[PDB]
């Protein structure tokens, strides 16, 4: 398998672009930044609202939990290569604590609303709008030869007042190289594509499009998250019970994948369920046939069949957002 687009980005660029292990970090001054309050955390870090003591401007301080220098260098290089891209978080400085040598990444401040409370109030247009803004970020990073690999609501920060969106936490992101076998232990379970769940390691940018599709389905059907599996095997089962196993086997046969017999039996056999069946009274105002058409073109087992981020931005579902932007 290879990416259908941007497959040669890292082939054509200087090895210094993608050879993140050769990174030399120019450490800043830890004292330039002061923690104000904790605003988030995950397995790999804690995130704080901070203040830049010099200009007294707000910023974000991401304190990294203990990990190999390789993973730290990877996130830093990706952030530096993407800096300035549309809707990409801006890495401003990198500092470390002397004694502990705990690294912190400093970002421009981002002022988000809890997705669990925001999403229920989004209008159909807001959905279309925010999804389009997220697409810009994904098309940009893919175009720069990078896969995010952890698209989920928690990593999409939205300032609803200002209608500003930022794709954050590049800690799981990787550089795309044709034929490379990547680790499938990426993304949040509910947003993992089938390729991850069936051990297809030579995946690509299209993984992020499945994740986006999961988010999107969640939003239009008001169902967070949409595919609610308890473990990785259950995750594929829940996907199979919607998409159907026919397409699953077609997919498995095309890429010559054999499922684990245990997994094969959990999955079983299931007919495809039309998207409309998920329609209900709470979600009805958000569910145009254009919504369904777009969603159906994202949530495909076959990563090669999925819309690219570029194609997605041009789907008629987004026509009003494009018209508005074009002024």
Swiss-Prot record:
InterPro entries attached here? CK2_alpha, Kinase-like_dom_sf, Prot_kinase_dom, Protein_kinase_ATP_BS, Ser/Thr_kinase_AS
- Asked if the record carries the keyword ATP-binding, the reply is yes
Q: Which domain of life is it from?
A: Eukaryota
Drop me one GO molecular function for this one: protein serine kinase activity
Q: Which residues form a coiled coil?
A: none
Subunit field text: Tetramer of two alpha and two beta chains (possible).
Q: Tell me its family.
A: Belongs to the protein kinase superfamily. Ser/Thr protein kinase family. CK2 subfamily.
Q: What does this protein do?
A: Casein kinases are operationally defined by their preferential utilization of acidic proteins such as caseins as substrates. The alpha chain contains the catalytic site.
Protein name in the entry = Casein kinase II subunit alpha
Native organism is Zea mays (Maize)
Q: Which gene encodes it?
A: ACK2
